[PDB]
Design a protein around this ligand. Structure first.
Ligand SMILES: [Ca+2]
Ligand SMILES: [Ca+2]
Ligand SMILES: [Ca+2]
Ligand SMILES: [Ca+2]
Ligand SMILES: [Cl-]
Ligand SMILES: [Cl-]
Ligand SMILES: [Cl-]
Ligand SMILES: [Cl-]
Ligand SMILES: [Mg+2]
Ligand SMILES: [Mg+2]
Ligand SMILES: [Mg+2]
Ligand SMILES: [Mg+2]
Lengths: 386, 386, 386, 386
């Protein structure tokens, strides 16, 4: 039951299943994985593909000859398995040089270095067939108020993104960028902390059409925000270029639990939205197999991500298709929500005595919304209790 | 010391000092205030002006003759005191008709009614001299996932805002709109939950130049976000049309404490930013004198808002002017943050061996940022311990 | 399917289904319910009983003759339906006199009044057959640091509880007290904010055996705490005298959603714990039918509380009974967790070279815990995907 | 101004200033410090002493001869400087063996090992003169619900603590234990998550008099709790054996900012409470110099901890001593809060018509608490604006 296949478009970062378990308070609990092994094991599980940071695939500091060999072996694994690489990103956070940021480091030399490191990897991402290039500005921010003038930092961030858009345009690449927001951790506050902030920022770029968002479940939940609502807004804006799926139990450190763990009902409403909107991009998991687990547990966690997506997909579909639910949705006036408020125009609205002078506000107020009955139908579908 | 005058541009909502103390679990602890009394008392405290919801000034359901008399007496108080009315807003949340929203109610008749109620009040706001019209979509949202299709709701919200922009344009009014975001309460999740979400939404409106934001301290803090950072972004976008000042102790119900209470250091960095950016609009307080207080305590709380702003203004100014701080800011490379990363252009960056092939990343990494020393100078200034 | 009967011990507060929908920003959306109607309607739904605050049953200020008639009619409804009243409590929060608390009001006269109001109602609770008397110190706390000396307030709270224990003892009543913790709202911070704080406090009372806790799902979740873990601790202490079931979506205002909404997986693990521990008390719902709902929606929400409990009970039972789960639990060493660490004693532990000098820490470290596989079995059971 | 001296009893963990800057997403930014250097540098700053985990002082795996030399050199530094070691603790979290806990690991062998590792270090702590032995159960908990039966885990935790109390008693040591609560991180939820939970647990131990708490500012703030209120309760219980001072900006990952950063007003009310209660133990800082900082910044951050404590101490003292504040405190009835509610006894209270039948609740309700004026006096004192 609920067996993934590559047509489901499930993808995983190399850094997910490859996480060695080092946390702020603990040493590694697992050995490093060869990317080749991870491709092979994921393929066996039904995955469609993998994503990488530059430094996951090619150890920082590698010679060109080493670099060539790492890529060659990785490409052989993809060829052996039929796995794709839909997305890649740059590690602008691990090396101590990025301690005050990459693109918005106070030190100009560091900003220039961050751009050069990104550009090098964009070339590689294209060669591997990636359609999306993610930027996660995890070190862009501050722990204290004087340390970063945020207007200056946003000027730097815009400059960076504008230069990367010039580069892709100059090379004739089809690849697009996706900003992954996060509100805090590792910096006390991170710039562009939410989907809303990233969307707004994009509209200030020279070529806004090249940039979207890569929202992560856990990250919006770390601000206590409603993830399906943020995704709806991104979709509404035409900017959902990629999505990062995982779980998170509330407002705390970034847990990166397997998808479906954490807020299960939010997961349900997310899959409902993605499927009903016809989202066609990768279903990418950015999760950490807990450091309690050995390698068998790693592969169990990854299989569980995909399984949970497919179960929720089934239940959401059954929800939307159920004639009793369709009736409930009409009872709750969701059909009315989708109709124009005033397609008649402003003057007609102004002249419509039924909209004000003769509006019976007490009758309107007395009509129940019937949302509880609708929501219990949703719960019954999720739990298979219909 | 730290005595407000009207040139400080301190304003208060009628609903702030007029709050009767009714909370979810308690009845009113104070009698209603006549708006006339509130204007008079605020003026005596050094305030510049007041703001109102339609229903604060004119009781819901009033006849035209009653409406005329309420406005006449209010205008006499303004004339008697020299107080201004820089901003107004519509109550689209108290009456049970708005239980599922105003502009995004599922019921079309309610949406039309909300627009008509707003338009009526825009006319009044203009007559009273307001430059900004605030919209706080406090009932726009949901407690359950099926109850609101957010893409449909955003279509409705855009339609609403677009119609209001048509109206103001058709009448030749100079007034501009400001959206006040809030993440939750009274709905489980509110649409446009943060400054970022509101900014992004504005860029989809037919006339984006007519709309900005009215961020509230407590509201961004309820998402655990950094308020000065959100304000920086709004300023960066040219959209800080108004601001709502108050205090909040973390992620919980909307406390609306007097400004300076709550996160005191965040208040410091906010006033530093507003003053250094030359923000010229009203310094508006949206606060609730706690229901423990009698009328003397109400006026004490209001005086305290203004006092705290003025103390922080002094300390921030002293901070920025201190030659030791200026030296620390250079030590922390804040001057470098404000310089272009690559004014030489993309090709020059690509050809610059100092940016990659010959960049000494270990030397760069070893340079401390000196942010702790800078931050302690900031603390010493805030506390007057220099 | 999943039809409640009175043997399930489902109970509801009169204030739950009777909530008129007044919130901080909105007027009532529903008329008041007669308690008699609520008893009748709940009975029809399969409920076992109801609970009350003094002022839910008898309007504040009632004459003795009015008081007698209100009780008489309520008792007739219980007799007509077979409904029980297992728990009652005092309203020490709505009336403005309690604005700074009841038992810990700074004003001594108010503290004395709060005690007298409680004692009167304890007599009534006993006459109605209640076994538990709840205290929810919702106004006991502060919005500012100087307003309440917490050590003095805890002295007052102890004095209050000690006097109530003297009273029940003096009258020969079998009733026991249960403290309901809440971290904030309506006060900025509430005293005894969590289950842990209440448990600790109880151990300082003169007769600790008379006092336990009445933890509420939403309340521990408002501190971001794990509700099933808090309940485990209360059970471990022998102090789970009653429980309040509802839902809550994270750290925000107290939502009081119907049970099962909110954190669904946490609900699962709670019902698993209650059932496996053989908790025998009332399954009490403290929920608010959302103010969007009319009276039909009220009864739908209440039915949904019970339905969700029964679904989760089935799934948890199936989980624990499944031989594959039992195998997984052994693989994860849950059986070992339940065995003594050192039943051999301290000296034997000290002399055991296998515990230190010859302990192979690397072998131990390499053993995976297999928790992900266990957790996915749990998810598959919850969702009926086995 | 505000220069620390050893009589201030400021102490630091070796792991604080010695933090190399490794975070979940980043490599070390600073070299390791020799404990000897840290003692010397702290002494120069005015510190009173240092604390250690076993593994901070003696590298895990050291031979007895290596162990002897590490201790010898450390003791020479203490002798050279006059620095004390008031507290020590065991590292039961870094090594992968502790991935599922120490005392409550599901694997019995690990639990036994954790006890043996602790006991060894208790002997060392005593030899170095420590009066308090801290336990921080950072790995005791779970990320999923089936992984840990919390009642079984609490049985194991009690067994562990009981054995350690037997050991100290058997050796005639004067040292006492202090449990340091934390709600989450590194485990999804940590057992004994708050001060309240730890206090309650202690009352179940065989010798409760040997155990107290070591509350940390940031940790209670991570649950959104009021730290000064938790400290008041610990003091009320007679269990404040030690305290960990730092800063934290709200509900998020454990930031461990320097004391005074984070919630500045909460810091004020904490120092006010500690000083007014006559807390006589170490003022211990558990802080992380941000990884942006070089070694000069490390020492700046440490100096800042002490400076901020001393500034707040001055301001709190000035607050309490100010005759206008004393008048305000009487106006707010804080003196009445400190008087018994019913020293006359239960019968007299029952017979007192002024407490109920003749209590004028409307007069009582109308009396304002004057808390805003009191709180603004507090703000004016904190900011030196009197
Ligand atoms: Ca994440
Ligand atoms: Ca607010
Ligand atoms: Ca509640
Ligand atoms: Ca900490
Ligand atoms: Cl922007
Ligand atoms: Cl948008
Ligand atoms: Cl206690
Ligand atoms: Cl306990
Ligand atoms: Mg991600
Ligand atoms: Mg506001
Ligand atoms: Mg309750
Ligand atoms: Mg600590």
């Amino acid at each position: 039951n609920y067996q993934p296949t590559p047509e489901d478009r499930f993808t995983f970062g190399l850094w997910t299943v490859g996480w060695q378990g080092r946390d702020p308070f603990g040493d590694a609990t697992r050995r490093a994985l060869d990317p080749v092994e991870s491709v092979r094991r994921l393929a066996e599980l039904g995955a469609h593909g993998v994503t990488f940071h530059d430094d996951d695939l090619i150890p920082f500091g590698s010679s060109d000859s080493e670099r060539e060999e790492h890529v060659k072996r990785f490409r052989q694994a993809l060829d052996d398995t039929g796995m794709k690489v839909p997305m890649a990103t740059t590690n602008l956070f691990t090396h101590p040089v990025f301690k005050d940021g990459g693109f918005t480091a106070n030190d100009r030399d560091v900003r220039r270095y961050a751009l050069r490191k990104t550009i090098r990897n964009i070339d590689l991402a294209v060669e591997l067939g990636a359609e999306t290039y993610v930027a996660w500005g995890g070190r862009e921010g501050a722990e204290s108020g004087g340390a970063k003038d945020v207007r200056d930092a946003l000027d730097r961030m815009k400059e960076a993104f504008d230069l990367l858009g010039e580069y892709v345009t100059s090379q004739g690449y089809d690849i697009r960028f996706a900003i992954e927001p996060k509100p805090n951790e590792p910096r006390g506050d991170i710039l562009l902390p939410t989907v809303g902030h990233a969307l707004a920022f994009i509209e200030r770029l020279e070529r806004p059409e090249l940039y979207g968002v890569n929202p992560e479940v856990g990250h919006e939940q770390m601000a206590g925000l409603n993830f399906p609502h943020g995704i709806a807004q991104a979709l509404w804006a035409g900017k959902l270029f990629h999505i990062d799926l995982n779980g998170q139990n509330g407002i705390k450190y970034d847990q990166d639990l397997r998808f479906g763990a954490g807020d299960l009902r939010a997961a349900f409403w997310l899959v409902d939205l993605l499927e009903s909107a016809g989202y066609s991009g990768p279903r990418h998991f950015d999760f950490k197999p807990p450091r309690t687990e050995d390698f068998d547990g790693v592969w169990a966690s990854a299989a569980g991500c995909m399984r949970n997506y497919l179960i929720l997909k089934e239940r959401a579909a059954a929800f939307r298709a159920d004639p009793e639910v369709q009736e409930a949705l009409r009872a709750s006036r969701l059909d009315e929500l989708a109709r124009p408020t005033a397609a008649d125009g402003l003057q007609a609205l102004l002249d419509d005595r039924s909209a004000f002078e003769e509006f019976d506000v007490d009758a309107a107020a007395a009509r129940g919304m019937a949302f509880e009955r609708l929501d219990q139908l949703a719960m019954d579908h999720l739990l298979g209790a219909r």
